């Protein structure tokens, strides 16, 4: 009934490989719904390079933990039946399901094939640095165990255009298959960033184009998805992702939300991509991700007035999926840029209580990351989810008018009981700030939902109130 949306990435990189994650999801549905979560982004649910694979070393997109391939029936998360049981539970609890989609490459080929290739400059793929010669690449996929269920398409080297490993001479190099082009258009870092890892798919082939379109539709119908989380799209030809997206929305009755991961600390690059997509999807606010990181790393000298400066939610709050961290940014991972405990609460309040952006809660922060002795922040986040779910409504007023202390308010809406809130925080010494919260809320007494401050704020006749916060902390006052 107008309820704010809150997405949750239900997994972290160091989750246990006990194949019980789908069951946890099923049992957690109700609690998650009650807490304020409206959508769940599940990890790649298909068979990867191995059982313990997080999902990105995707082997067979049609095996959702149902066939004995790559040394296991189930995936790291569980069986196909448990995943469907989980999804059903989420649905009955009014939670949308977004599937993670990996179409950039494939890994775990069943066998190798002789292929004429050329070495290219790692920092500039447009440039070859060797003559063409035959290498043995892992490009043959037969999916033994699936027995052609759902599809009989088989992958071969001619469906790809590159790999980073030659089994013949057993060496690592970035190989571009001779007489094949890098995809385009794609991100231009390193000249051409078509190749990332594994066996890189060449979308110029109409047969590839159709297979992934057909697969996408089969996947969407099989799990009854409500959207997707498009993986490593800055490496995938832009025109194709666009094509693919349009194709799925055409085949599916239900609406489909789409958020793509274009990983670049550059809002312009992201805007350029959204232009090419005709703004038909949202993108994770990566610059914002790094804003939080820079602020976490720098400390009190960071000017809080520029916290949203350069973000995506700032420029196009309607096409931005905001978050603080994920499986790639947690300690030790490839895109590490972890927001420390002291700042994480400020970051979360910033994406959960403001009107712009679609906020996403990270499983790792919510339940903690045991592997790294990172505590569960459930308590701190639930309070903010309560703020977002019941108080972050109505007209917004911002106050990024000081380097340490900044805040904003939401007047609330007639449609919702006691909604309305005032957020204030400082990444340096504490302080206070007079902010407007709507003359219609005059005479109310607001208290801090987080409990980081006991101050009791009464709204005066003109709709104003003075809010407080201690150093390096955040408060969210509401009429409770
Ligand atoms: K690519
Ligand atoms: K981060
Ligand atoms: K500061
Ligand atoms: K605290």
Asked if 100 and 229 count as a contact pair (C-beta separation under 8 A), the reply is yes
Instruction: Answer yes or no: is 194 a known binding residue.
Output: yes
Q: Residue 305 Cα, ligand 3 centroid: separation in angstroms?
A: 8
Examine residue 185 and say whether the peptide bond preceding it is cis (omega within 30 degrees of 0).
Answer: yes
The protein residues having their C-beta less than 5 angstroms from ligand 1 (an ion) are 104, 194, 200, 235
202 is in an annotated binding site: yes
> Which residues neighbour 439 within 8 Å (Cβ) at sequence distance 6 or greater?
461, 462, 463
DSSP, collapsed to helix, strand or coil, labels residue 378 as helix
Please check if 260 is assigned to a binding site: no
Domain 1-103+206-393 classification at class level: alpha beta
Instruction: Please say whether the beta carbons of 39 and 9 come within 8 A.
Output: no
Å from CA of 193 to ligand 1 middle: 7
- Please state the φ and ψ torsions of residue 380, each to the nearest 5 degrees: -70, -35
How many angstroms is the resolution? Answer: 2.5
Residue 57 φ/ψ, nearest 5 degrees:
-85, 55
Q: How far apart are CA 98 and CA 7, in angstroms?
A: 9
Q: Please answer whether residues 190 and 235 qualify as being in contact, where contact means their C-beta atoms are separated by less than 8 angstroms.
A: no
- How many whole angstroms from 44 Cα to the centroid of ligand 2? 21
Query: End-to-end CA distance of the chain, in Å?
Result: 21
Sign of CA dihedral 25, 27, 33, 35: negative
Method of determination is X-ray
Beta bridge pairs of residue 16: none
Catalytic residue among 231, 314, 325, 382: 231
Maximum distance among all Cα pairs of the chain, rounded to whole angstroms = 81
**Closest C-alpha among 85, 63, 84, 81 to residue 72:** 63
Centre of ligand 3 from the C-alpha of residue 408, in Å: 17
Superfamily of domain 394-480: Golgi alpha-mannosidase II (2.60.40.1180)
Number of Cβ atoms within 10 Å of the Cβ of 165: 18
Domain locations along the chain: 1-103+206-393, 104-205, 394-480
CB neighbour burial string for 190-211, b if at least 16 within 10 angstroms, e if fewer: bebbbbbbbbbbbbeeeebbeb
Q: Which ligand has its closest atom nearest to the C-alpha of 182?
A: 1
Decide if 199 contacts 107 (C-beta within 8 A).
yes
226 known ligand binder: no
Tokens of 415: 């449609």
Distance 331 CA to ligand 4 centre (A): 22
∠ CA 189-191-194, nearest 5°, is 75
Q: Ligand 2 is a single-atom ion; what residues have CB below 5 A from it?
A: 289, 293, 325, 329, 337, 339
What 397-402 contacts at long range (C-beta under 8 Å, 24+ apart), as own/partner pairs, is: 397/435, 397/436, 397/437, 399/433, 399/435, 400/304, 400/305, 400/307, 400/308, 401/305, 401/433, 402/304, 402/305, 402/431, 402/433
Q: Could you give the CA distance from residue 292 to residue 294 in angstroms, rounded to a whole number?
A: 6
| Residue 283 · residue 273 · CB < 8 Å | yes
Separation of CA 346 and ligand 4 centre (Å): 11
Taking each helix axis as running N to C, give the angle between helix 21-35 and helix 378-390, from 0 to 180 degrees, rounded to the nearest 10: 50
Judged by its nearest atom, the ligand closest to the C-alpha of residue 335 is 2
Q: What are phi and psi of 360, to 5 degrees?
A: -125, 125
407 is in an annotated binding site: no
State the Cα–Cα distance between residues 262 and 233, nearest whole angstrom. Answer: 6
3-state class (DSSP) for residue 470: coil
Q: Which ligand is closest in space to the CA of residue 469?
A: 4
List, in order, residues 6 or more apart from 441 with CB less than 8 Å away: 411, 412, 420, 459, 463, 479
Both structure tokens of 459: 């709204």
Whole-number Å distance, alpha carbon 155 to ligand 2 midpoint, is 36
Reply yes or no on whether 187 is catalytic. no
- CATH number for the domain running over 104-205: 2.40.30.140
CA distances in angstroms from 285 to 90, 319, 389, listed in the order given = 26, 9, 21
Q: What is the 3-state secondary structure of 280-303?
A: CCEEECHHHHHHHHHHHHHHHHCC
Please tell me if the domain spanning 1-103+206-393 has the same topology as the one spanning 104-205: no
Catalytic residue among 211, 261, 365, 411: 261
> For residue 53, how far is its CA from the centre of ligand 1 (angstroms)?
20
Question: According to the annotation, is 235 in a ligand binding site?
Answer: yes
Residue 199 · residue 139 · CB < 8 Å: yes
Q: Which ligand is located closest to the Cα atom of residue 345?
A: 4
Tell me whether residue 261 is one of the annotated catalytic residues.
Answer: yes
**DSSP secondary-structure letter at 213?**
H
Nearest-ligand number for the alpha carbon of 163: 1
In angstroms, what is the span from residue 119 Cα to ligand 1's centroid? 16
CA quadruple 341, 343, 345, 350: dihedral positive or negative? negative
């Amino acid at each position: 009934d107008g309820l704010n949306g809150t997405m949750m990435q239900y997994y972290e990189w160091h989750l246990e490989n006990d194949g019980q994650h789908w069951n946890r999801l099923h049992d957690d549905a109700a609690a998650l719904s009650d807490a304020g979560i409206t959508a769940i982004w599940i990890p790649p649910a298909y068979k990867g390079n191995s059982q313990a694979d997080v999902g990105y070393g995707a082997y067979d997109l049609y095996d959702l933990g149902e066939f004995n391939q790559k040394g296991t029936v189930r995936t790291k998360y569980g069986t196909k039946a448990q995943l469907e049981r989980a999804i059903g539970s989420l649905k009955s609890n009014d939670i949308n399901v977004y599937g993670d989609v990996v179409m950039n490459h494939k890994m775990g080929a069943d066998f190798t094939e002789a292929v004429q290739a050329v070495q290219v400059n790692p920092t500039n793929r447009w440039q070859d640095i060797s003559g063409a010669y035959t290498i043995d690449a892992w490009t043959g996929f037969d999916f033994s165990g699936r027995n052609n269920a759902y599809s009989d398409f088989k992958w071969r080297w001619f469906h790809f255009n590159g790999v980073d490993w030659d089994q013949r001479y057993q060496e690592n190099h970035i190989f571009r298959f001779a007489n094949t082009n890098w995809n385009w258009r794609v991100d231009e870092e390193n000249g051409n960033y078509d190749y990332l890892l594994g066996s890189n798919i060449d979308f110029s082939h109409p047969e590839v184009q159709d297979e992934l379109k057909d697969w996408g539709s089969w996947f969407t119908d099989e799990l009854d998805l409500d959207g997707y989380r498009l993986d490593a799209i800055k490496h995938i030809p832009f025109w194709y992702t666009s094509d693919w997206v349009r194709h799925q929305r055409n085949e599916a009755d239900q609406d489909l939300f789409v958020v793509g991961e274009y990983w670049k600390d550059d809002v312009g690059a992201l805007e350029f991509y959204l232009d090419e997509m005709n703004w038909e999807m949202s993108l994770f606010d990566v610059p914002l991700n790094y804003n939080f990181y820079r602020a976490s790393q720098q400390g009190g000298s960071y000017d809080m007035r520029n916290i949203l400066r350069g973000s995506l939610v700032e420029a196009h709050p309607m096409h931005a999926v905001t978050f603080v961290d994920n499986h790639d940014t947690q300690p030790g991972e490839s895109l590490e840029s972890w927001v420390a405990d002291w700042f994480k609460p400020l970051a979360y309040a910033t994406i959960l209580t403001r009107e712009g952006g679609y906020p996403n809660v990270f499983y790792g922060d919510y339940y903690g990351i045991p592997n790294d002795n990172i505590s569960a922040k459930k308590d701190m986040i639930d309070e903010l989810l309560d703020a977002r779910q019941n108080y972050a409504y109505g007209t917004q007023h911002d106050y990024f008018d000081h380097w340490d202390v900044v805040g904003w308010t939401r007047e609330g809406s007639s449609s919702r009981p006691n909604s309305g809130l005032a957020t204030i925080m400082s990444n340096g010494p504490g302080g206070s700030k007079w902010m407007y919260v709507g003359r219609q809320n005059a005479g109310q007494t607001w208290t801090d939902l987080t409990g980081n401050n006991g101050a009791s704020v009464t709204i005066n006749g003109d709709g104003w109130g003075e809010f407080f916060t201690n150093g390096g902390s955040v408060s969210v006052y509401v009429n409770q």
